[PDB]
Design an enzyme around this catalytic site. Structure first.
Site, PDB file in Angstrom:
ATOM      1  CG  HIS A   1      -2.808  -2.620   3.696  1.00 36.80           C
ATOM      2  ND1 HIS A   1      -3.826  -3.296   4.335  1.00 36.80           N
ATOM      3  CD2 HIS A   1      -3.032  -1.303   3.923  1.00 36.80           C
ATOM      4  CE1 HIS A   1      -4.610  -2.424   4.949  1.00 36.80           C
ATOM      5  NE2 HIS A   1      -4.150  -1.206   4.717  1.00 36.80           N
TER       6      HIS A   1
ATOM      7  CG  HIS B   1      -8.245   2.535  18.928  1.00 32.22           C
ATOM      8  ND1 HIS B   1      -7.565   1.333  18.898  1.00 32.22           N
ATOM      9  CD2 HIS B   1      -9.080   2.479  19.994  1.00 32.22           C
ATOM     10  CE1 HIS B   1      -7.960   0.593  19.921  1.00 32.22           C
ATOM     11  NE2 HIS B   1      -8.887   1.256  20.595  1.00 32.22           N
TER      12      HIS B   1
ATOM     13  CG  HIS C   1      -0.303   5.710   4.588  1.00 33.32           C
ATOM     14  ND1 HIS C   1      -0.820   4.978   5.639  1.00 33.32           N
ATOM     15  CD2 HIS C   1      -0.712   6.988   4.780  1.00 33.32           C
ATOM     16  CE1 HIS C   1      -1.493   5.787   6.441  1.00 33.32           C
ATOM     17  NE2 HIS C   1      -1.435   7.012   5.946  1.00 33.32           N
TER      18      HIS C   1
ATOM     19  CG  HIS D   1      -5.100   5.436   7.024  1.00 32.54           C
ATOM     20  ND1 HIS D   1      -4.956   6.691   6.474  1.00 32.54           N
ATOM     21  CD2 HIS D   1      -4.726   4.553   6.070  1.00 32.54           C
ATOM     22  CE1 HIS D   1      -4.496   6.579   5.242  1.00 32.54           C
ATOM     23  NE2 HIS D   1      -4.354   5.295   4.977  1.00 32.54           N
TER      24      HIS D   1
ATOM     25  CG  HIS E   1      -7.330   0.173   8.587  1.00 28.12           C
ATOM     26  ND1 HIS E   1      -6.097   0.276   9.194  1.00 28.12           N
ATOM     27  CD2 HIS E   1      -7.114   0.381   7.267  1.00 28.12           C
ATOM     28  CE1 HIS E   1      -5.173   0.521   8.280  1.00 28.12           C
ATOM     29  NE2 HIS E   1      -5.765   0.596   7.102  1.00 28.12           N
ATOM     30  CB  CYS E   2      -7.401   0.864  14.324  1.00 31.18           C
ATOM     31  SG  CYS E   2      -6.181   1.500  15.476  1.00 31.18           S
ATOM     32  CG  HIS E   3      -2.117   2.923   9.974  1.00 28.31           C
ATOM     33  ND1 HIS E   3      -1.023   2.084   9.978  1.00 28.31           N
ATOM     34  CD2 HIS E   3      -2.218   3.390   8.702  1.00 28.31           C
ATOM     35  CE1 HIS E   3      -0.498   2.041   8.760  1.00 28.31           C
ATOM     36  NE2 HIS E   3      -1.206   2.820   7.958  1.00 28.31           N
ATOM     37  CB  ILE E   4      -2.841  -0.023  16.319  1.00 26.56           C
ATOM     38  CG1 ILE E   4      -2.482   1.335  16.946  1.00 26.56           C
ATOM     39  CG2 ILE E   4      -2.175  -1.180  17.093  1.00 26.56           C
ATOM     40  CD1 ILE E   4      -3.153   1.602  18.296  1.00 26.56           C
TER      41      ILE E   4
ATOM     42  CG  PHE F   1     -10.624  -1.557  15.463  1.00 30.12           C
ATOM     43  CD1 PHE F   1     -12.007  -1.421  15.494  1.00 30.12           C
ATOM     44  CD2 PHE F   1      -9.864  -0.753  16.311  1.00 30.12           C
ATOM     45  CE1 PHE F   1     -12.611  -0.471  16.315  1.00 30.12           C
ATOM     46  CE2 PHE F   1     -10.465   0.200  17.145  1.00 30.12           C
ATOM     47  CZ  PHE F   1     -11.843   0.336  17.145  1.00 30.12           C
TER      48      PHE F   1
ATOM     49  CG  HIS G   1       2.256   0.271   5.144  1.00 29.57           C
ATOM     50  ND1 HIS G   1       1.143  -0.517   5.359  1.00 29.57           N
ATOM     51  CD2 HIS G   1       1.810   1.554   5.115  1.00 29.57           C
ATOM     52  CE1 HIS G   1       0.070   0.251   5.425  1.00 29.57           C
ATOM     53  NE2 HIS G   1       0.448   1.515   5.305  1.00 29.57           N
TER      54      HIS G   1
ATOM     55  CG  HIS H   1      -5.623  -2.450  17.717  1.00 28.40           C
ATOM     56  ND1 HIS H   1      -5.691  -1.207  18.309  1.00 28.40           N
ATOM     57  CD2 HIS H   1      -4.990  -3.257  18.606  1.00 28.40           C
ATOM     58  CE1 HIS H   1      -5.138  -1.263  19.510  1.00 28.40           C
ATOM     59  NE2 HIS H   1      -4.706  -2.495  19.715  1.00 28.40           N
TER      60      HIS H   1
ATOM     61  CG  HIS I   1      -1.693   1.188   1.466  1.00 28.70           C
ATOM     62  ND1 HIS I   1      -2.527   1.730   0.512  1.00 28.70           N
ATOM     63  CD2 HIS I   1      -1.761   2.007   2.543  1.00 28.70           C
ATOM     64  CE1 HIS I   1      -3.093   2.819   0.995  1.00 28.70           C
ATOM     65  NE2 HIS I   1      -2.643   3.008   2.222  1.00 28.70           N
TER      66      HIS I   1
ATOM     67  CG  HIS J   1      -6.875   2.818   2.353  1.00 26.83           C
ATOM     68  ND1 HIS J   1      -6.103   1.857   1.737  1.00 26.83           N
ATOM     69  CD2 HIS J   1      -6.648   2.686   3.682  1.00 26.83           C
ATOM     70  CE1 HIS J   1      -5.449   1.166   2.653  1.00 26.83           C
ATOM     71  NE2 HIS J   1      -5.756   1.654   3.843  1.00 26.83           N
TER      72      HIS J   1
HETATM   73 CU   LIG Z   1      -6.495   0.418  17.462  1.00 28.49          CU
HETATM   74 CU   LIG Z   2      -0.636   3.029   6.034  1.00 28.43          CU
HETATM   75 CU   LIG Z   3      -3.494   4.156   3.600  1.00 28.70          CU
HETATM   76 CU   LIG Z   4      -4.938   0.542   5.285  1.00 28.62          CU
END
Ligand SMILES: [Cu+2]
Ligand SMILES: [Cu+2]
Ligand SMILES: [Cu+2]
Ligand SMILES: [Cu+2]
Ligand SMILES: *[C@@H]1O[C@H](CO)[C@@H](O[C@@H]2O[C@H](CO)[C@@H](O[C@@H]3O[C@H](CO[C@H]4O[C@H](CO[C@H]5O[C@H](CO)[C@@H](O)[C@H](O)[C@@H]5O)[C@@H](O)[C@H](O[C@H]5O[C@H](CO)[C@@H](O)[C@H](O)[C@@H]5O)[C@@H]4O)[C@@H](O)[C@H](O[C@H]4O[C@H](CO)[C@@H](O)[C@H](O)[C@@H]4O)[C@@H]3O)[C@H](O)[C@H]2NC(C)=O)[C@H](O)[C@H]1NC(C)=O
Ligand SMILES: *[C@@H]1O[C@H](CO)[C@@H](O[C@@H]2O[C@H](CO)[C@@H](O[C@@H]3O[C@H](CO[C@H]4O[C@H](CO)[C@@H](O)[C@H](O[C@H]5O[C@H](CO)[C@@H](O)[C@H](O)[C@@H]5O)[C@@H]4O)[C@@H](O)[C@H](O[C@H]4O[C@H](CO)[C@@H](O)[C@H](O)[C@@H]4O)[C@@H]3O)[C@H](O)[C@H]2NC(C)=O)[C@H](O)[C@H]1NC(C)=O
Ligand SMILES: *[C@@H]1O[C@H](CO)[C@@H](O[C@@H]2O[C@H](CO)[C@@H](O[C@@H]3O[C@H](CO[C@H]4O[C@H](CO[C@H]5O[C@H](CO)[C@@H](O)[C@H](O)[C@@H]5O)[C@@H](O)[C@H](O[C@H]5O[C@H](CO)[C@@H](O)[C@H](O)[C@@H]5O)[C@@H]4O)[C@@H](O)[C@H](O)[C@@H]3O)[C@H](O)[C@H]2NC(C)=O)[C@H](O)[C@H]1NC(C)=O
Ligand SMILES: *[C@@H]1O[C@H](CO)[C@@H](O[C@@H]2O[C@H](CO)[C@@H](O[C@@H]3O[C@H](CO[C@H]4O[C@H](CO[C@H]5O[C@H](CO)[C@@H](O)[C@H](O)[C@@H]5O)[C@@H](O)[C@H](O[C@H]5O[C@H](CO)[C@@H](O)[C@H](O)[C@@H]5O)[C@@H]4O)[C@@H](O)[C@H](O)[C@@H]3O)[C@H](O)[C@H]2NC(C)=O)[C@H](O)[C@H]1NC(C)=O
Ligand SMILES: *[C@@H]1O[C@H](CO)[C@@H](O)[C@H](O)[C@H]1NC(C)=O
Ligand SMILES: *[C@@H]1O[C@H](CO)[C@@H](O)[C@H](O)[C@H]1NC(C)=O
Ligand SMILES: [Cu+2]
Ligand SMILES: [Cu+2]
Ligand SMILES: [Cu+2]
Ligand SMILES: [Cu+2]
Lengths: 500, 500
Positions: A111, A396, A66, A399, A453-456, A464, A109, A459, A64, A401
């Protein structure tokens, strides 16, 4: 650096970024991966060559980019089982997309599951030859990119489902590990009298960092690839996958200064130079900065203090719910999986985009059921993410897309700003202790299925996430797909489990 | 437990509270030391018997009874080189004082250099047979005292001047160490259906703790030995030397629940059960609570939410400086020593009390010069401690001997409460990031020299202290001294350095 036309060889190697040797996922031999570069408007052709051999860190991959809108190139966005099936080992796949009306600081990164934690992550900068901030600085290049990363001695698929801390913080790929008493410090060089555009990028899988540079202030001019009015701070919190460009004026005495990136949990502090790098002036001695009580921040960054450089009308009208489509998200967790409006994301075997192109009629027909949410085309959207103790692991960072969004209400603030809120792509949703209700707005100008989604990363792996099916009716016409993309699923689906 | 009349043998011993063996300073063979007990109004005769042999942790000692007013017994307060010369090894000294109009949760610790960090510290409870809160609980005894400690594997005089985190957090004397991968968890036992008065005491040399108990709220009824209106929270921060009593209602399912005491720096988090203890219901298995994402606090304690149980007037009038004597303290630091109004505290060879008893007329004449500040008798006092980046190591928790004080302005708050602010004896002075200016009031009803200092023991050692000469002219009459006290200085001063 490489790019905008480049090969990215994804492979396994033993690495020791913090002085401890472990097997990782690397890009052109290194983790973090090389800086990818281009200019505003460039067409990128990033040929991802999967040479991975280690199933424990996954032999497949999906990358991905980002922050990129991917308008009409949804198939290149990289979300595994949303925008594509993964690339299979022994195969290449070229991500061909444009930085259309975009410039700033991005990153890339894996994904696919938690694979980016095992090393597949690097910085990505799109330069603006007409950068409106250009007169504020003298130096902006590979050596002014600063990456932050959490590093674990146990691989992502071998440790806890929810790691309770990291083993080191890496700054530009290097750092000290408290648990092994090993590691070196990155050196960032400056020349007295010159001004630097440092491009700070969190490649974190989990912790947020409190980032500062001893003896120096930071003038923020960019947040998540959108230009801001300059705003000077002496420290900042940076959440997983956020970016800031800040000006550093190298006007202090010639010396070595600590660069600090302190995680919110794990090894917190600076004993033995953990969570640290060195800002070294030309002519300073080759030495570490002196062991010091860490200095106190007087002007920490507040997100509510950031404003768009250009007057940007906020979508909709200046009242709560004054948009075409307003959605509130109720978070929950059952000890194993996270939920958004009572749905937990599990990756479908047919990628969401392929389900759409194959003729799925409405978002209710899309899999996973309850996780795919339609958005009407050409409309103003408002999303609220009220913080709740039902979803522990706060704060949290969410993010979206395919989009940047106006942060109408930030974490740690009760204000709604319909006038000049910051535009970004990753936002902390804060904590129930503050009664936070982070609220964002955007326009649906981009047909296709987009992750939220949460970018942790741990998670996200635990579900998530939701997917917006934005302008479903217009998605096929907006996103013609290359045959190489169509071939990814048959190839991947033919793999035995141990070869995935 | 021991007291109110007891012998306290101070010795050296090898101990392993977190499963790593090191030499320590212990009290009656233990660290933390035994619970000292008595009832409201009792006369305490605490015979401190110094049997120390190890100069590296100091062979001399001086014990402070933290929170006691010591009215007319200034000589028993225990501040080394302020209230007495240290007790010498091979000698005893009896601290004879009264819990006059005082009852609640206290503690005791060495007040000689950083010796309390090496183990000389323990809890001290004065029971009230007529406790106005007694109807709120069923159980209040030795098994309901909860102590928190930072524990170091390297001794205080052998490690850094300013440690940045400890090797373990001990709850009731036990805990896990991430440094050595050793240690056991303390078990706090409850019976379903009973209500508990837990008395939480920080014996910290440095970090503050964020304390909570999974699945249970805590109803605060006492802060620093002053009764409060009941106030229910689900987590709290507790700074070095503060105390809270809280009610826990054991009405949850029979199970094991995590007790959490997370330091602000060091190893932050709960990997492998560090910073943890177990709340175990009778009938639950002998096992750890389930591994879990740490829960999010919804109602953290704010100091501005605490109010005195009984209407207590605030000294002076409800305006800034509306007192007989108002003093502002400007903090600074030079890399080695801390300063308060440009003076750093260095202990004088003649204790301040003895300087006064010997006929020093002005606080101008008292040593160390610049660090001893006169206060007028029977007057209202207002002190302000504005947070400043000139004194790093924030937040600094300040403590005043001989007095409790009204916290008119708390850290993290811009409001001044002149009507019903909490009374306490240790207060966080917060951060310059928040523009904090913590402000306290008291009345000078207690003649004698009283320490005021940061309770981060490493900062005290680095000089972050002043002494108030309260009612100088009335000091000799108010504080008759025993011959045994007068003998301490000649005995101590006869020692070779290696015997100190
Ligand atoms: Cu989270
Ligand atoms: Cu990302
Ligand atoms: Cu992204
Ligand atoms: Cu993503
Ligand atoms: C965090 O912030 C969010 C956002 O502010 C907040 O959620 C809002 O809370 C307010 C206050 O409680 C809600 O307001 C009530 O709404 C009642 C019913 O209205 C409904 O109608 C809406 C339809 O509006 C149209 O346009 C919108 C865009 O504005 C668009 O979405 C729709 O297509 C629609 O055509 C609608 O928004 C809302 O829909 C729901 O959204 C989700 C979908 O995911 C749904 O599942 C939820 O059930 C949610 O309700 C719904 O259908 C209304 O009757 C009520 O009016 C009462 O009180 C007022 C107070 O003065 C009285 O005057 C009046 O007489 C009524 O008795 C009230 O206005 C608002 O609907 C929420 N908004 C959303 C988007 O959910 C969270 O609570 C915050 N959380 C925390 C913890 O702080
Ligand atoms: C494919 O990719 C994967 C993922 O990267 C590679 O996975 C690696 O597998 C190897 C071999 O199985 C792993 O080594 C093992 O690690 C375990 C668990 O380790 C941790 O927990 C221990 C138990 O609580 C703890 O004691 C350890 O801490 C000590 O040791 C470390 C060194 O490992 C040291 O740094 C510390 O200071 C501590 O002293 C540790 O944190 C471990 O138990 C194994 O040890 C046993 O087996 C070995 C085998 O050689 C034996 O010699 C020992 O006596 C012991 O009994 C072993 O070390 C490795 O950790 C995995 N890597 C990652 C990143 O997770 C895999 O190798 C790749 N495949 C190929 C073909 O390359
Ligand atoms: C009177 O009281 C004294 C104080 O209590 C007591 O002092 C004891 O003296 C003995 C004998 O000298 C000491 O033992 C010796 O310790 C040294 C130093 O070891 C320790 O420190 C090193 C260095 O730590 C720093 O650097 C490392 C690496 O960069 C970092 O990781 C670390 O964070 C620090 O920055 C450290 O590596 C050591 O740790 C190893 O060893 C321990 C066990 O020793 C392991 O648990 C650990 O996992 C690791 O493997 C260690 O912490 C050492 O070099 C010598 O070999 C020797 O061990 C005692 O430590 C010291 N006690 C205390 C509490 O300080 C006197 O003994 C006493 N007098 C009498 C008569 O009893
Ligand atoms: C944190 O809070 C602090 C407390 O509010 C604040 O300090 C205060 O700042 C204000 C605003 O600038 C000052 O107000 C200005 O005061 C001067 C007059 O100053 C002189 O007189 C007052 C009153 O004296 C009499 O009454 C007091 C009791 O109220 C008695 O103690 C005193 O004996 C007299 O009888 C006096 O308090 C001042 O004291 C001095 O304090 C130190 C020495 O101890 C000096 O270095 C300092 O400069 C000051 O002179 C002084 O003698 C007036 O001209 C202005 O119009 C305005 O009212 C307060 O004086 C000051 N209070 C104190 C106690 O210092 C901090 O600024 C704040 N910090 C931050 C960062 O926010
Ligand atoms: C940075 O900013 C603070 C507050 O604006 C200021 O006090 C400090 O002197 C500045 N430091 C510099 C320019 O080095
Ligand atoms: C504790 O208090 C919180 C916040 O008021 C409440 O929501 C929760 O249900 C309570 N838990 C108990 C009593 O176990
Ligand atoms: Cu104390
Ligand atoms: Cu005290
Ligand atoms: Cu301090
Ligand atoms: Cu003291």
């Amino acid at each position: 650096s490489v790019g905008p036309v480049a090969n990215l060889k994804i492979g396994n190697a033993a690495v020791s970024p913090d002085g401890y040797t472990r097997d990782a996922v690397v890009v052109n031999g290194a983790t973090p991966g090389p800086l990818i570069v281009g200019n505003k408007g460039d067409n990128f052709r990033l040929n991802v060559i999967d040479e991975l051999t280690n199933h424990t860190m996954l032999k497949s991959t999906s990358i991905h980019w980002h922050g990129f809108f991917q308008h009409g190139t949804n198939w290149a966005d990289g979300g595994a089982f949303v925008n594509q099936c993964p690339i299979s080992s022994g195969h290449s796949f070229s991500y061909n997309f444009q930085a259309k009306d975009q410039a700033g600081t991005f990153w890339y990164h894996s994904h696919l599951s938690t694979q980016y934690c095992d090393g597949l992550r690097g910085p990505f900068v799109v330069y603006d030859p007409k950068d409106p901030h250009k007169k504020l600085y003298d130096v902006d290049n590979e050596s002014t990119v600063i990456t932050l990363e959490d590093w674990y001695h146990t691989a992502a698929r071998l440790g806890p489902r929810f790691p309770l801390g990291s083993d080191s913080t890496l700054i530009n790929g290097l750092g000290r590990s408290a648990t092994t008493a090993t590691g070196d410090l990155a050196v960032i060089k400056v020349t007295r009298g010159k001004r630097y555009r440092f491009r700070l990028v969190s490649l974190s899988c989990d912790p947020f960092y409190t980032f500062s540079i001893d003896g120096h202030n930071m003038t923020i001019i960019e947040a998540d690839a959108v230009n801001t009015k300059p705003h000077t701070v002496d420290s900042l919190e940076i959440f997983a996958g956020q970016r800031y460009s800040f000006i550093l004026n190298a006007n202090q005495p010639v010396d070595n200064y600590w660069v600090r990136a302190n995680p919110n949990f794990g090894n917190v502090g600076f004993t033995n130079g953990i969570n640290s790098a060195i800002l070294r002036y030309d002519g300073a001695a080759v030495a570490e900065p002196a062991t010091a009580i860490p200095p106190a921040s007087v002007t920490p960054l507040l997100e509510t203090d950031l404003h768009p450089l250009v007057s940007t009308p906020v979508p909709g009208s200046p009242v709560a719910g004054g948009v075409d489509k307003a959605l509130n998200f109720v978070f929950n967790f059952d000890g194993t999986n996270f939920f958004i409006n009572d749905a937990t994301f599990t990756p479908p075997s047919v990628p969401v985009l392929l389900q759409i192109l194959s003729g799925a009629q409405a978002a209710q027909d899309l899999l996973p059921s309850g996780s795919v949410i339609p958005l009407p085309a050409l409309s103003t959207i408002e999303l609220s993410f009220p913080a709740t103790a039902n979803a522990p692991g706060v704060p949290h960072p969410f993010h979206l897309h395919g989009h940047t969004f106006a942060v109408v209400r930030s974490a740690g603030s009760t204000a709604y700003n319909y006038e000049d809120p910051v535009w970004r792509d990753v936002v902390s949703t804060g904590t129930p202790a503050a009664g936070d209700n982070v609220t964002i707005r955007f326009v649906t100008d981009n047909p296709g299925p987009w992750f939220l989604h949460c970018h942790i990363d741990f998670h996200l792996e635990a579900g998530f996430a939701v997917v917006f099916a934005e302008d479903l009716p217009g998605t096929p016409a907006a996103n013609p797909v290359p045959q190489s993309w169509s071939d990814l699923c048959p190839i991947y689906d033919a793999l035995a489990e141990d070869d995935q």
